Design a binder for this molecule. Structure first.
Ligand SMILES: [Mg+2]
Ligand SMILES: [Mg+2]
Ligand SMILES: [Mg+2]
Ligand SMILES: [Mg+2]
Ligand SMILES: [Mg+2]
Ligand SMILES: [Mg+2]
Ligand SMILES: [Mg+2]
Ligand SMILES: [Mg+2]
Ligand SMILES: [Mg+2]
Ligand SMILES: [Mg+2]
Ligand SMILES: [Mg+2]
Ligand SMILES: [Mg+2]
Ligand SMILES: [Mg+2]
Ligand SMILES: [Mg+2]
Ligand SMILES: [Mg+2]
Ligand SMILES: [Mg+2]
Ligand SMILES: [Mg+2]
Ligand SMILES: [Mg+2]
Ligand SMILES: [Mg+2]
Ligand SMILES: [Mg+2]
Ligand SMILES: [Mg+2]
Ligand SMILES: [Mg+2]
Ligand SMILES: [Mg+2]
Ligand SMILES: [Mg+2]
Ligand SMILES: [Mg+2]
Ligand SMILES: [Mg+2]
Ligand SMILES: [Mg+2]
Ligand SMILES: [Mg+2]
Ligand SMILES: [Mg+2]
Ligand SMILES: [Mg+2]
Ligand SMILES: [Mg+2]
Ligand SMILES: [Mg+2]
Ligand SMILES: [Mg+2]
Ligand SMILES: [Mg+2]
Ligand SMILES: [Mg+2]
Ligand SMILES: [Mg+2]
Ligand SMILES: [Mg+2]
Ligand SMILES: [Mg+2]
Ligand SMILES: [Mg+2]
Ligand SMILES: [Mg+2]
Ligand SMILES: [Mg+2]
Ligand SMILES: [Mg+2]
Ligand SMILES: [Mg+2]
Ligand SMILES: [Mg+2]
Ligand SMILES: [Mg+2]
Ligand SMILES: [Mg+2]
Ligand SMILES: [Mg+2]
Ligand SMILES: [Mg+2]
Ligand SMILES: [Mg+2]
Ligand SMILES: [Mg+2]
Ligand SMILES: [Mg+2]
Ligand SMILES: [Mg+2]
Ligand SMILES: [Mg+2]
Ligand SMILES: [Mg+2]
Ligand SMILES: [Mg+2]
Ligand SMILES: [Mg+2]
Ligand SMILES: [Mg+2]
Ligand SMILES: [Mg+2]
Ligand SMILES: [Mg+2]
Ligand SMILES: [Mg+2]
Ligand SMILES: [Mg+2]
Ligand SMILES: [Mg+2]
Ligand SMILES: [Mg+2]
Ligand SMILES: [Mg+2]
Ligand SMILES: [Mg+2]
Ligand SMILES: [Mg+2]
Ligand SMILES: [Mg+2]
Ligand SMILES: [Mg+2]
Ligand SMILES: [Mg+2]
Ligand SMILES: [Mg+2]
Ligand SMILES: [Mg+2]
Ligand SMILES: [Mg+2]
Ligand SMILES: [Mg+2]
Ligand SMILES: [Mg+2]
Ligand SMILES: [Mg+2]
Ligand SMILES: [Mg+2]
Ligand SMILES: [Mg+2]
Ligand SMILES: [Mg+2]
Ligand SMILES: [Mg+2]
Ligand SMILES: [Mg+2]
Ligand SMILES: [Mg+2]
Ligand SMILES: [Mg+2]
Ligand SMILES: [Mg+2]
Ligand SMILES: [Mg+2]
Ligand SMILES: [Mg+2]
Ligand SMILES: [Mg+2]
Ligand SMILES: [Mg+2]
Ligand SMILES: [Mg+2]
Ligand SMILES: [Mg+2]
Ligand SMILES: [Mg+2]
Ligand SMILES: [Mg+2]
Ligand SMILES: [Mg+2]
Ligand SMILES: [Mg+2]
Ligand SMILES: [Mg+2]
Ligand SMILES: [Mg+2]
Ligand SMILES: [Mg+2]
Ligand SMILES: [Mg+2]
Ligand SMILES: [Mg+2]
Ligand SMILES: [Mg+2]
Ligand SMILES: [Mg+2]
Ligand SMILES: [Mg+2]
Ligand SMILES: [Mg+2]
Ligand SMILES: [Mg+2]
Ligand SMILES: [Mg+2]
Ligand SMILES: [Mg+2]
Ligand SMILES: [Mg+2]
Ligand SMILES: [Mg+2]
Ligand SMILES: [Mg+2]
Ligand SMILES: [Mg+2]
Ligand SMILES: [Mg+2]
Ligand SMILES: [Mg+2]
Ligand SMILES: [Mg+2]
Ligand SMILES: [Mg+2]
Ligand SMILES: [Mg+2]
Ligand SMILES: [Mg+2]
Ligand SMILES: [Mg+2]
Ligand SMILES: [Mg+2]
Ligand SMILES: [Mg+2]
Ligand SMILES: [Mg+2]
Ligand SMILES: [Mg+2]
Ligand SMILES: [Mg+2]
Ligand SMILES: [Mg+2]
Ligand SMILES: [Mg+2]
Ligand SMILES: [Mg+2]
Ligand SMILES: [Mg+2]
Ligand SMILES: [Mg+2]
Ligand SMILES: [Mg+2]
Ligand SMILES: [Mg+2]
Ligand SMILES: [Mg+2]
Ligand SMILES: [Mg+2]
Ligand SMILES: [Zn+2]
Lengths: 362, 206, 60
RNA sequence: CGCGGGGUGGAGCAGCCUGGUAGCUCGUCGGGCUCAUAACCCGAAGGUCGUCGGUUCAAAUCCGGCCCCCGCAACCA
RNA sequence: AAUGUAAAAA
RNA sequence: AACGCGUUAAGCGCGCCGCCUGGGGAGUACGGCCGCAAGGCUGAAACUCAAAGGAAUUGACGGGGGCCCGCACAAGCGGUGGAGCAUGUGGUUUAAUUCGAAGCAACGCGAAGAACCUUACCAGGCCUUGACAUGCUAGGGAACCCGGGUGAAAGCCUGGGGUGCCCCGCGAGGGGAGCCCUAGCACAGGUGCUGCAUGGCCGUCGUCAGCUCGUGCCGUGAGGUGUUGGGUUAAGUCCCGCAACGAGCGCAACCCCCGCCGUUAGUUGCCAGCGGUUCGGCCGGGCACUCUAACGGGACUGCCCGCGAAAGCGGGAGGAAGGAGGGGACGACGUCUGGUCAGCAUGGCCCUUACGGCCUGGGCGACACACGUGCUACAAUGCCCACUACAAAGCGAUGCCACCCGGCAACGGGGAGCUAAUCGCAAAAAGGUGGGCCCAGUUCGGAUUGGGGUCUGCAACCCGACCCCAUGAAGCCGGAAUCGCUAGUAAUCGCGGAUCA
């Protein structure tokens, strides 16, 4: 297990010098009496002190399992050297906590997730590749300990999928499948091509947890104003002296509506409200779109080069264009070996591009 | 696409068994294993002079290895120093009677197993493989012969895609038995991979 | 698992049945004749070289 | 709210009036012909009969309330 | 008695 | 430009008008003029492409044509698809179910021997120039043999025995070769990737008759001619003709088995021939015959007839065998970016207390399914039991085992013959004769399973095979569909060998 040591060790090492200088500018700010006088402004101050716990603990735990472990173990069959191995069996136990406490910090990492696959540039082979990816994440779920349900799926003309969607249950379902965003790339001699030469094919992937609803709470009586007024058109003296028309404007949203199709004020006041309900439902569905579709991807051309990870079956090599990381087993990776990818490199760069954005300028 | 080994095609005519003797339901396996590793040492520390064929004759502890170098000069040395030290190593790894004879070569340009090693030599030397084959054929045909043929297949000139280069002249009916055709294969270790060579010299008839 | 494996078939430092056939030239395990102690492949090469006395391309 | 109709395999429709066994087309699934897909051939699976009650030996079927969809009507001053 | 996309000639 | 034109110029000249100036946009838009209208005349650009085109050449292709071929179709027999089982694969499952093969040309294929071995996978215990090579430095120990502690084995830890061969010597001792061990360096090792880097070998259309070169002639040129054409054959086989003539790789032929026969050969064989006989070719005896494995002979459209220019074809006689007598070996220039880097070799790439090495146990034998290849049957042209006759080719001395004894039996014991035309595996089965069953899920059918038992091998839970008793399943001829075979063939019956305890 000496191949993942320096990876996890140095992983908690780059936070040492940076947080060292910042916590110093804060800890000395917590001294002067004039600081705490600020109401909630001072909470943001003592808050950063609540981080000197989830940083100094590694300065002690990770540093001790590096100074003591690396010593007595350089050479010996099983005497005092192999006996020092179980001494750090908890070093892999504690490795779990440092890894976890940097993934759940995502928006909704803890809850489940939905993953929709859809073919793209690459002809009918691309339509066939999508089913491969489906069968990849599917096995990756069971083997991760997750449950799976195909929420929807549609076979292609000759391939096997023009579209597919799969809800993965279990904790951190959105966390692990997060870096699976974007279009992947496939390279291999096309099984559908007569000359069988090497063709490229693409396919997009998306991930997102889940939400709820709120239909009636909107039509709170406190919000909208209701008006009464005589009706336009026929009626006799009854129409002139009896106001039955109604105008139910929604004050906040400003959207108004008027009705007077029936001789009655209540049945108009009633209808005019069922009408406002429909429009206010269609106004909540429009705003319900940006906050449930912008999370998918701010782009995703699915074209060429829009990919973030290529899988070449000719020369046998996958490659994450994000971490620059490489590999030599596309045949197994497209079966469940996503852990090696998501764990070390994927979640890293994923949180890195946002973790370097906040701790600098954003 | 087929083309069987003309040598094996004539183990009942033309070419006679390279190793020739007799064994039983218990000696054949051994008398072959050792017999083989014999030529193993000779293929190496003897080709340095153009070793073509190598016979074997036995019956009981007797062994008559008849080398056919193009130049016996290197196999003997100048009197008996070299040729003797061979029987040395031989009897060394084999507690049996040696008998290293040394037949000759009336003309190396007519031993296919030689011409093969010939062109194959020029290959590793890094020279043309179209011009080369042409010489080795025009030489074999000019140096008296009924027919001849040479072939090299693989990365001709270290090129990306493989290939196969053809060159031949005169009659060479591999389907006729009353033909006789010296055959000889040869490799060519290079910085870009192996590379097979073949020689088809048409000799006798009837 | 090719060289230390042909070596395994040689030492016979253990039980009877555990020893098994093996080719002399290559190291094959299946299709290895006892008569020559060779795999079907090389046997065909050698038999075309005449390096197997008495043997000849049969036909009837 | 009033009067009329409807809700049955995944889609669209029979069956109810005259209670006893739920049928048709499509799709789905297995197997064929084709280099392969479709077409075509051979098999197979699939229905709480909206829901809650009532009558009956027995309810898709008859009786009643409810939810849902459809159409009509909502006129005189 | 229809169809078969998109990376190969020193 | 070629196709073609050619006193009906697309020739050679003069006069005049009309018209073209890359494709798409586009005969569109705008404007103008005409029209009842539909629409016509005139007639752009932005933008965009690196081509759009003409004629001709080779080839591929056609629900184009002519000629011709192959169990390709038809005529005919027997099959799979159905059932149970074996096996190969898909898939699913698993700690792993190691890898490859993918229409024909992957699917009883690599595997001509997965219980550990094999074995490349998994779990676990372990070793770190290492199981194997070449070479440098070093201490110690000869080589080599032997046991105890430890354990699942591997490995680890440890004791006794031992004192050979060379240099200085009476000895002591010390220096050297070889081998093993520790330490260290160079290096090993990899069934780890890439058959879209390769050799080699192989499948493939296809045993199809075809594919080319030299010189010559035609064309500006790709290229054509030859190889086309009339006749024929299994064939680019031959015949004739031909602006071509000639040659090469392919079909043939030269090799093998099987048919008839002769010579060489007499431990195979035969009272065929006489004698003897424990009447078994056992003895005397002979090479006839059979057989045995060596060399030859014979068949070539040679002979008669009809047609024909010839080649050749049709019929007949003789012949064991007539136009290739039957079967095999042999498969062109090439095509499939075919197959295999896992048989081996190999360029590049990757790992190196490890992607290498050792063992014990597991898996490759997993099962809700699907396909391929196959075995056994549904029965009376049959099943069972007893008796009786006829093969070929093969294999066997730590191997095949006659013969007698025990046992229901597989097997166990005693024990003869045999480096084998001399002895054994060895009843060949179907068939012949006899006898019973009498149309029944049955004496058909033996899947399944309970119990008992034999053999191999350290070891049969996972996971072998065989024997005996008992239990006897699906299956009454198989949906759509699909396979093989033209003669000693299909069908059917049994025997052998490789692989290997
Ligand atoms: Mg309020
Ligand atoms: Mg108004
Ligand atoms: Mg009115
Ligand atoms: Mg009024
Ligand atoms: Mg009023
Ligand atoms: Mg009022
Ligand atoms: Mg070759
Ligand atoms: Mg060429
Ligand atoms: Mg010539
Ligand atoms: Mg090389
Ligand atoms: Mg090895
Ligand atoms: Mg074995
Ligand atoms: Mg419905
Ligand atoms: Mg009725
Ligand atoms: Mg009725
Ligand atoms: Mg249907
Ligand atoms: Mg179907
Ligand atoms: Mg079917
Ligand atoms: Mg059916
Ligand atoms: Mg079904
Ligand atoms: Mg009801
Ligand atoms: Mg509705
Ligand atoms: Mg509605
Ligand atoms: Mg109305
Ligand atoms: Mg009214
Ligand atoms: Mg009114
Ligand atoms: Mg009125
Ligand atoms: Mg009125
Ligand atoms: Mg009135
Ligand atoms: Mg070039
Ligand atoms: Mg003319
Ligand atoms: Mg004229
Ligand atoms: Mg005139
Ligand atoms: Mg004229
Ligand atoms: Mg212009
Ligand atoms: Mg233009
Ligand atoms: Mg115009
Ligand atoms: Mg127009
Ligand atoms: Mg206009
Ligand atoms: Mg005008
Ligand atoms: Mg006008
Ligand atoms: Mg006018
Ligand atoms: Mg008009
Ligand atoms: Mg009109
Ligand atoms: Mg118009
Ligand atoms: Mg107009
Ligand atoms: Mg007009
Ligand atoms: Mg104008
Ligand atoms: Mg103009
Ligand atoms: Mg204009
Ligand atoms: Mg044209
Ligand atoms: Mg044609
Ligand atoms: Mg037609
Ligand atoms: Mg015609
Ligand atoms: Mg015609
Ligand atoms: Mg016609
Ligand atoms: Mg057929
Ligand atoms: Mg038929
Ligand atoms: Mg017929
Ligand atoms: Mg059947
Ligand atoms: Mg079946
Ligand atoms: Mg079946
Ligand atoms: Mg397999
Ligand atoms: Mg499955
Ligand atoms: Mg496992
Ligand atoms: Mg499997
Ligand atoms: Mg496989
Ligand atoms: Mg085995
Ligand atoms: Mg060593
Ligand atoms: Mg040395
Ligand atoms: Mg040194
Ligand atoms: Mg010593
Ligand atoms: Mg010692
Ligand atoms: Mg000593
Ligand atoms: Mg003990
Ligand atoms: Mg011990
Ligand atoms: Mg000595
Ligand atoms: Mg001395
Ligand atoms: Mg002394
Ligand atoms: Mg001493
Ligand atoms: Mg020494
Ligand atoms: Mg030494
Ligand atoms: Mg290797
Ligand atoms: Mg290939
Ligand atoms: Mg190759
Ligand atoms: Mg032919
Ligand atoms: Mg010319
Ligand atoms: Mg031709
Ligand atoms: Mg003809
Ligand atoms: Mg002529
Ligand atoms: Mg002529
Ligand atoms: Mg002969
Ligand atoms: Mg005579
Ligand atoms: Mg007599
Ligand atoms: Mg007589
Ligand atoms: Mg008598
Ligand atoms: Mg006698
Ligand atoms: Mg006598
Ligand atoms: Mg003779
Ligand atoms: Mg003849
Ligand atoms: Mg004649
Ligand atoms: Mg004649
Ligand atoms: Mg006459
Ligand atoms: Mg003539
Ligand atoms: Mg004549
Ligand atoms: Mg004549
Ligand atoms: Mg005739
Ligand atoms: Mg034949
Ligand atoms: Mg031939
Ligand atoms: Mg299952
Ligand atoms: Mg299938
Ligand atoms: Mg009997
Ligand atoms: Mg008997
Ligand atoms: Mg007999
Ligand atoms: Mg034998
Ligand atoms: Mg033996
Ligand atoms: Mg006895
Ligand atoms: Mg017994
Ligand atoms: Mg016994
Ligand atoms: Mg006895
Ligand atoms: Mg004896
Ligand atoms: Mg004998
Ligand atoms: Mg004998
Ligand atoms: Mg016998
Ligand atoms: Mg019955
Ligand atoms: Mg009966
Ligand atoms: Mg045991
Ligand atoms: Mg049945
Ligand atoms: Mg079929
Ligand atoms: Mg036939
Ligand atoms: Zn081999």
């Amino acid at each position: 297990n000496a191949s993942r040591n320096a990876w996890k060790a140095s992983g908690g090492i780059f936070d040492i010098p940076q947080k060292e200088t910042r916590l110093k500018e804060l800890e000395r700010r917590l001294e002067d009496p004039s600081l705490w006088n600020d109401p909630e402004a001072a909470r943001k101050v003592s808050q950063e002190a609540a981080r000197l716990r989830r940083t100094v603990d590694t300065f002690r735990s990770l540093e001790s399992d590096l100074q003591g472990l690396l010593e007595l173990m350089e050479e010996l069959p099983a005497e005092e050297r192999e006996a020092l191995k179980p001494e750090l069996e908890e070093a892999a136990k504690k490795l779990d906590e440092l890894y976890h406490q940097t993934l759940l910090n995502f928006p909704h990492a803890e809850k489940n997730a939905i993953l929709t696959i859809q073919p793209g540039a690459g002809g009918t082979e691309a339509c066939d590749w999508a089913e491969m990816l489906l069968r990849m994440y599917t096995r990756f779920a069971e083997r991760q300990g997750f449950q799976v349900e195909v929420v929807d799926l549609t076979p292609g003309p000759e391939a096997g999928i023009d579209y597919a969607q799969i809800l993965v249950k279990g904790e951190n379902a959105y966390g692990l499948l997060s870096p699976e965003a974007g279009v992947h790339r496939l390279v291999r001699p096309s099984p559908f091509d007569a000359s069988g030469r090497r063709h490229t094919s693409f396919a997009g992937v998306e991930v997102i947890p889940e939400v709820d609803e709120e239909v009636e709470v909107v039509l709170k009586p406190e919000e909208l104003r209701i008006d009464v007024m005589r009706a336009s058109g026929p009626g006799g003296p009854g129409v002139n002296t009896t106001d039955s028309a109604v105008r139910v404007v929604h004050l906040p949203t400003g959207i108004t509506v008027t009705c007077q199709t029936t001789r009655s004020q209540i049945k108009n006041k009633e209808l005019a409200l069922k009408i406002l309900k429909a429009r206010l439902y269609e106004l909540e569905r429009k705003k319900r779109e940006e906050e449930l579709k912008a999370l998918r991807g701010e782009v995703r051309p699915i074209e060429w080069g829009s990919q973030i990870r290529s899988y070449v079956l000719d020369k046998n090599y996958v490659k994450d264009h994000r971490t620059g990381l490489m590999r030599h087993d596309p045949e197994n990776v497209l079966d469940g070996d996503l852990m090696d990818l998501i764990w070390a490199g994927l979640e890293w760069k994923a949180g890195r591009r946002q973790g370097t954005e906040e701790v600098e300028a954003e | 696409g087929n083309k069987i080994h003309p040598i094996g095609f004539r183990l009942g005519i033309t070419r006679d068994w390279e190793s020739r003797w007799y064994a039983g339901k218990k000696q054949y396996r051994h008398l072959l294993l050792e017999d083989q590793r014999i030529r193993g040492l000779l293929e190496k520390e003897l080709y340095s002079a153009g070793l073509a064929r190598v016979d074997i004759e036995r019956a009981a502890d007797n062994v008559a290895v008849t080398v056919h170098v193009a130049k016996p000069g290197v196999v003997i040395g100048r009197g008996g120093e070299r040729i003797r030290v061979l029987r040395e190593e031989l009897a060394k790894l084999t507690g049996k009677n040696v008998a290293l004879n040394v037949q000759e070569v009336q003309n190396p340009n007519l031993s296919a197993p030689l011409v093969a090693q010939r062109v194959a030599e020029q290959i590793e030397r890094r020279f043309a493989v179209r011009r080369a084959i042409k010489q080795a054929v025009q030489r074999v045909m000019e140096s008296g012969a009924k027919g001849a043929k040479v072939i090299v297949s693989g990365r001709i000139g270290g090129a990306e895609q493989a290939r196969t280069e053809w060159a031949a002249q005169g009659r060479v009916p591999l389907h006729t038995l009353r033909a006789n055709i010296d055959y000889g294969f040869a490799l060519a270790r290079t910085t870009y991979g192996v590379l097979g060579v073949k020689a088809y010299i048409f000799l006798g008839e009837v | 698992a090719r060289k230390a494996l042909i070596e395994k078939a040689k030492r016979t430092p253990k039980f009877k049945v555990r020893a098994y056939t093996r080719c002399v030239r290559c190291g094959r395990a299946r299709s290895v004749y006892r008569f020559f102690g060779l795999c079907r492949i090389c046997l065909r090469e050698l038999a075309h070289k005449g390096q197997l006395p008495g043997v000849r391309k049969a036909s009837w």
